[PDB]
C-alpha cells in the first residue's frame, strides 16, 4: 500500500498545534488517546493524515478508518528525527494541566477572604490573598525532577474550559479588589532580558524553547514587590494612580487588551487574549523560528530519504529545503499571536523598577 | 454529414417524448453551482429546507468524531441547514471571507468554523431539544486569519475554502424518519458563550456546492423520477427556471435543443421574417392550430400573416432556443409542434443531396480575386527590386 | 388551446392580493373590472391571468388581450370551490371603505373641535368629543340588513392617500393632546381574547376571519375609561404617563411600531404603520392560517382536475398535496404582514385596569 | 433579509424580466423617442422624501436579446460590416463596453477557431519558422523597404 | 483533413474579408451579458441616456 | 505604416487632459518636452501615440518613441489647425507660472509681519500688507504687450508642491489671524457679472473663454474696501463676525470646501481646491464648449480624409458629426468638472457689498 507525502502549509499547521501540544496523533496500542506516552503510527498534520513510521498520507477524517489500513511501509523513517516533536507537544500537555492546576489553586485562595477583610484592604491597599509558590502543582516535571516527558499525562477533563472559567473569575474580581500583582509583567521582552533577577532568579536559566536539553523543573518567578510596600509615598492612593494593573492593563470587563502574569510555571508567564475581543486565550511566549529549527534535522532526513519530484510536489519551491528558508523568512508572518501586540500601550507602574524573585504570587492595592 | 451526426447525437423522439421516458438515457453529468445560503430563498424553491424564523431555539452540543475531538457549538433560532436527507452524495467547498463575524471578546480572525451534519429521525425544524438532532457529526473545520479589507476600518476575512465531500453510502439511511442536515457554524473544542455570537449561522457565506448526482429533477411544480421532455418543454418562468437547480432536467433539455438548434441553422440560412423551408412545418402547426376551434376568443388570420409571425418565431429561436422550457411560453406554447419541427428537421438533413448558396462564395472569390490582385502587384514591386532578367 | 395549471409561488400571490385586494381579475361583465359582482372568468395569479372554468393560466403582464377568442376551456370546475376567492376579495374592499369612512368621521369631529375649546380641554383633562355608533354608518353593507356582499361596490378614487394624510395629522394632533382615544387596543389579541367581554361584549363572539360561515355584523366597542374620567382621583398627568398610546406604543414620532385599533366594525380590529415607517398601511387583524384553510378544499378539487405528472413538473416535486402541507408548515411565514408584528413589543401599564364595552368613540386628555 | 454580517441586510432574489420588441413599438415617428428604465413601481404618486433614488439601475441584470439580425459596429447595428477594418479596431474599454451583439466579439470567436486551425497545422514552436510564418517575415520586409 | 474541414467552417474569404459583409453573412450565434446601470459610465456607453 | 485614428472617448480625454494643459507634445528639436516652442511631429492621445503629420495613432503610451520612422504619411495635415490649441498650452503654462510667481511674493510679504506688528493689527484691523499691482509680475505678456506666447517657456520643477504648499500656508496664516483679503471671492458669478466697476475698469471685458483674438495683457482687478474702512459700521469685530473669509468659507482646516480669488490674472479668478480633499488645486472657471468648437475644424479635415466605416466604428452614431452633436449635447456634462462645483453653496456676508476694479492687493483684519 503505497503513501504520499505532506505539503509545507500542512507542515506548519502541524508545527502550530505541536506547539500548542494538540496534535492528534493516533497508535496502534492506544488508538487516537495519546494519554499513554508511545511511538506515534499516524498523525493529523495540516488537515492530512500522517503515517509516521513510513510518513505516507493517504486518508481524511470524512471517512472514518478503524486502525491505520495495512499499507506498504518505508520503515525508513527514523523516530529520532520527530521524536523532539512528540517530545514538544506532550511536554506542552503536561505544562497546560501544570497551568490549570496552578490557576484553580489561586481561585480557591482568592475565594477564601472575608468580606469586611476584603473592604478594609480594598480601602487601604496591601496584602490580601498570597499563594504559597511550593504549594503550586508540586508534583509536576516543571516543579518536581520525578515528572518526565515520556510519562503518562494527567487524565484531565475540559482543562481549557477551567482555566478560562477560573481566569475569567480572578480577573474579574482583582479588577473589583484593584489588586496589583506581583506575579504579573506588562512586558515579556524584560522577563528574559529587563528585570533585575535576584538570587536563584539570577541562576535562571531560560531555553526559550521546548528541547530535552534544559531542566523544565524551576520555581515561580515573582516580583520583589516588598520594597513598593515598604515604599511609604507609594500610599494606597498613589499606587491606584500608578501602580494599579487598570492603569496599566485596563479594566478586565472594559479593555481588549491581553494579560500576562510572570514565569510562574517553567520560567514562562501566562498570557490571556482580552475578554472584550470574544475571549481570554493563554500560551507561553515562544519565538516561532525555534520550533522550525527544530524541525530542521527532520527537514534534512525528509530531504534524503524522498523523490525530487515528489519532494518539490509536496515541499513546493526549492524543495523541501526551500520551502523551510522561504517560512524561516515568513515566520514572524504566520508563527506569531496578535494577541502579543495586543497589551496596553500605556504603563504607569511598570516592570523594571523592582527585581524579580521566585516568591509567593499575591496581589494588593 | 456533421449535421447528420448532429441529428444522431439529438435522438429528437425521445427528447420530444410526451409519455414517459427511462430516466437514465435522459439523464446527463450534472454542473456544480454556487449559492449562499443568507441569499438562499426556502419559499420559491421546493428543494430549499431551512429552520423556520420565529422558532427561536439555542441549544449547545458537543460531539466526539472518529479522530474523537469533542467539539462544543450550540445550534440558535432562525439557523439554516442543508437538508442532507433525499440529497444523495454532495460535496461542499465554503468561503467566509469578507465576513465581519467580530464578537464583543471573540476576534473572527484566528477562529475556526466547520461544517456539521446531524442524522435523526425528528425533522430539524420539528427539533426543539438537544436530543433531536441525533447523530450530529463535523464533516470538516476550518481555522483562519483575517485581515484590514479594501472597506475603509473595514477588514477582510482572508479567502478560504472549507470543503466536505458527503455520499449517501456513509449515512446508510435505512430510516425514512432519520433526517440528515448539512449546517456551517464556527465550531470549537471548548464550549463557546451564545450570547457573544449572535449569528445562526456561517452559512452567510460564498459556497460552493459538487452534486455526486444527477437522478433528482421538479417538474409541473412537482419532483420527478423520470422526466418527459414535452412535460419539460414551457413549463419553467425565468424566475421558476431560476429556482431549478442544474440537476433540473429543463437544462438537459436545452443542451439537447442546442445540438438541434445548430442543425436548423445549418438546414436555413434564410433572413429574417423571409419564408423558408425550415419553418413549412412550423406554418402547418399553425395552419392546424387556426383550424382548431378557438376556445373563448376565435379570430381567423391570413397565412401570409401566419407566415410572417411564423418567421418572427423562427428567428426568436435561433436568438434563443433556451426559451422552450419557459412555462407556458407565449412565443414556444406548443409542445406537439416543436416535436413535429424536430422530426422534420431531421428529415430535411436526411433528405439534403448536396445544395449549397453560391451568392457568398461568389462575393468570397472577388475578394480574393482583388487579394491576388494586390498579390500581383507587390510582386511586381518586388520585381522592381528583384527584376527577372 | 392548451393550458397551464398554477404553479405554488403565483397561489400564494393569488391568496395574498385576495386578502390584500389588489388581484387584477378579469369578468365579461365588467371586463377587467371588480366594481360590480359577477361569476369570475379571468384572474391574475403569481404575474399570470388564469381562466376560472378550466382553471388554467390564461395569460401573462407580458401581452394585452381585449377579450379571450374560444379556446380548450374544461369548464368541469364547480365555483363552489372558487366562490370563496371572489367572496374574500369583496368583503376585504368593502370593509376597507368602512373603515376609512369610520376614520373620516372622528378626524372630522376633531378638525370640527374649535382650537380654544382643545385648549381648555388640555387645561381640565377627559373626553375631547364623541359621536353616536348606534347611529354611526348603518349604511354599510355590514350595518344594514338590507344591504348584502352581492351588492355593488362603491366607486372609491384616492382612498390610499387620504387615509394616509388623515392617520398621520389625526396622529399628530392626538400627540399635541396627550388626549386618550379609547378606541384602540394595545394587544389585538386580548380583543379576541384578554379583555373583559360582558352584556353584548359578552353577546359578542369573534370568528377571527372573514369568511362567508359567520355573520361580519358588530357594533362599535371600546375601553372603559369613563369610570376613571368621573373618578378623577386617577390624574390626567397620570394617564398621560402610562394611558397615553405613545406610553404603551412608544413615541409615535420616535416609533415605527404599528398601533392597535379595538374591533369597531363587526368585532373587526385595524392594524395602523408606526410613523417612523412613514406611511399608513391599514389591515384586519385576521390569521393567514385561515387562507390556508380556505384553499385545502379547492386544492383537493384542482389535484382530480389535473394529471399528476403535469402536476410535479409545475409545482415541482412532492405534489401538491405535498405544496399544501408544505404550505400548511408555511402558513406562519409565507402570507405574515410585517406590521402585525411591527407595533411595540410590551405594555408596561396593562390592560386590566380597563375593561372594554360597546360605547361611542371619545379621546380624553 | 438580514445577512450572516451584522448590520448588513440582504435583499430576496429578483427575476424582474423585461421583454423589448422594437416592432411591438412599431416604431413611424423619428421623432418618437425609446426609453427604458427599472424601479420601484406604486400605483399612487411616491412622496419624493421617501425614496430619494434617481432610479433603481444600481442592480445587477441579466439581458437576453429578443433581436437576431442586429449587429453593432462603431456604436451602430450594421447591415454589413468590412472584416479587415475590424481587425484591430477596438480598445479594451471599447470592447468591454461592447453590448453582447457587438461585430468584435464575433470577428473574435471566428478568429479563434481560425487560431485553433493553424496550430493543429503548424507545430513549430515559438521562434521556431515554419511554412506559414516566412510570409509574414517577408510581408514585413517588404514593408520596411516599401 | 479535419484541419481543412474547420479552416473551411472558419471562411478565411470572410475573416479577412476587406470588402463590406451582410451583417447575416458574418455573424454567429450571440452570447448573455450582464451589466449594473447605475455603474456605466456614460462616457462609454452611446445606448443610454 | 498605415494609421488609424484613435477612440472619441479617448479624443474627449485627450481634450480634457490638453485643457489641464497637461498636453505631451514631441518635436525632433525638443523630443517630449514642450518647454521651448518647436512644430509638435507627434502627440499623445488618451495614453496612445498619434502622429502629428497624417493624423494617425501609431502606437501607445507604454512604448516609449525616441525618433519618427519613415512611414507612408498622408503629410495633409496643417500645423495651423492644431498650432492654436498649442497657442493656447502654451499661454496657459505661462499664465500658471505667472501664478505661481505672484504666489511666492505674496507668501514671502506675509512671513515678514512681525508678531508683535501683527498683534497690534489684531488690536486694531485694517490690510495688513498693500502690494502696488503696476508692479505685480509686469515682465509677463499678461501685463506686457510685448510679451508673447511665442516667448521661451520659463523653466519650473516642482511647480504643483511648490504651489500647494504656499496656498495652504498663506490660509493657515489667514484662518488663526481671521484675516481679510481684497483678492478673493465667494462666488464666481459676480466676477464678471455682479460685482460693481469703476471707471475704466467697465470698460474691461472678460471673455470667459479661451481665444488668440483677446489680447490677454490686462489690469488686475481685485475688491475695494477704500469705503469699507472710511464706512464706520463694520469694525474688526463687525468682519471677525461675517467679512472675513472664513465665515463664509469655513475654517480652512475643517472644510472640503474650494476658495477662489478675484480676477487677479488673465480676467481670471482662480480656484484652489479644499484642504481636507488632500490637496489644494488652482485652477480657472471656464466653459469647455470652445473646446469643442476648436476640434471643429480637425472633425471636418478627418471626414475629408477618413473612410466612412472606420469614422462610424471610432466616433460612434452620426460618425465624427453625429459625435459631435452627442458632444455638444453632453458639454455640460462631459466638459464640466465636479471641482468647478465644490464651493460652499452658502454666503452669509454676500458679494455685491464692494466694487471690484484693477486695483492692489490686500489682506486686512
Known sequence: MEVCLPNGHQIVDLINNAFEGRVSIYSAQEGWDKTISAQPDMMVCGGAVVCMHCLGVVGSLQRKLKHLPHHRCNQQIRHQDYVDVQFADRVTAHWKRGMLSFVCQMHAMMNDVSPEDLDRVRTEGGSLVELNWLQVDPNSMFRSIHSSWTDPLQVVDDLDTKLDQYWTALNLMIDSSDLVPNFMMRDPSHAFNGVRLEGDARQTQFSRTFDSRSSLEWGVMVYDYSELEHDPSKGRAYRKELVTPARDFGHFGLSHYSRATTPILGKMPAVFSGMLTGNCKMYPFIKGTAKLKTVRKLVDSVNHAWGVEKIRYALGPGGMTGWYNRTMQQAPIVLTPAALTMFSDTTKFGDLDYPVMIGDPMILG | ?389
Chains 1, 3, 6 share one sequence.
Not at chain 2, 82 to 104: C, H, W
Request: aromatic letters at 8%.
Open chain 2, 1 to 389: 454529414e456533421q449535421a447528420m451526426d448532429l441529428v444522431t447525437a439529438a435522438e429528437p423522439e425521445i427528447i420530444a417524448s410526451l409519455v414517459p421516458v427511462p430516466a437514465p438515457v435522459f439523464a446527463i453529468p450534472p454542473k456544480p453551482a454556487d449559492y449562499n445560503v443568507r441569499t438562499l430563498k426556502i419559499d420559491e424553491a421546493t428543494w430549499l429546507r431551512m429552520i423556520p424564523k420565529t422558532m427561536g431555539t439555542l441549544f449547545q452540543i458537543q460531539v466526539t468524531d472518529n479522530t474523537g475531538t469533542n467539539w462544543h457549538f450550540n445550534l440558535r433560532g432562525g439557523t439554516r441547514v442543508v437538508n442532507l436527507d433525499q440529497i444523495a452524495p454532495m460535496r461542499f467547498v465554503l468561503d467566509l471571507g469578507g465576513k465581519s463575524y467580530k464578537e464583543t471578546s471573540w476576534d473572527p480572525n484566528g477562529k475556526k468554523v466547520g461544517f456539521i451534519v446531524f442524522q435523526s429521525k425528528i425533522p430539524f425544524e420539528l427539533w426543539t431539544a438537544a436530543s433531536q438532532i441525533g447523530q450530529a457529526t463535523v464533516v470538516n473545520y476550518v481555522q483562519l486569519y483575517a485581515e484590514d479589507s479594501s472597506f475603509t476600518a473595514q477588514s477582510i476575512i482572508a479567502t478560504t475554502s472549507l470543503a466536505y465531500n458527503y455520499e449517501p453510502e456513509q449515512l446508510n439511511k435505512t430510516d425514512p424518519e432519520m433526517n440528515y442536515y448539512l449546517l456551517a457554524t464556527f465550531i470549537d473544542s471548548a464550549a463557546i458563550t451564545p450570547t457573544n455570537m449572535t449569528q445562526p449561522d456561517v452559512w452567510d457565506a460564498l459556497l460552493t456546492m459538487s452534486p455526486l448526482s444527477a437522478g433528482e429533477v421538479t417538474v409541473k411544480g412537482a419532483v420527478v423520477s423520470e422526466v418527459v421532455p414535452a412535460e419539460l418543454i414551457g413549463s419553467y418562468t425565468p424566475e421558476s427556471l431560476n429556482a431549478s437547480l442544474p440537476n433540473d432536467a429543463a437544462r438537459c433539455m436545452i443542451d439537447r435543443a442546442s445540438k438541434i438548434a445548430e442543425a436548423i441553422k445549418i438546414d436555413d440560412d434564410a433572413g429574417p421574417d423571409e419564408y423558408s423551408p425550415n419553418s413549412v412545418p412550423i406554418q402547418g402547426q399553425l395552419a392546424i392550430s387556426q383550424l382548431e376551434t378557438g376556445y373563448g376568443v376565435r379570430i381567423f388570420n391570413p397565412k401570409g400573416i401566419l407566415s410572417k409571425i411564423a418567421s418572427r418565431a423562427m428567428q426568436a429561436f435561433i436568438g434563443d432556443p433556451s426559451t422552450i422550457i419557459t412555462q407556458a411560453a407565449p412565443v414556444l406554447s406548443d409542445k406537439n409542434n416543436w416535436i413535429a419541427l424536430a422530426q422534420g428537421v431531421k428529415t430535411s438533413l436526411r433528405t439534403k443531396s448536396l445544395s449549397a448558396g453560391v451568392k457568398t462564395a461568389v462575393s468570397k472569390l472577388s475578394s480574393s480575386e482583388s487579394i491576388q490582385n494586390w498579390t500581383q502587384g507587390f510582386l511586381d514591386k518586388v520585381s522592381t527590386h528583384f527584376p527577372a532578367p
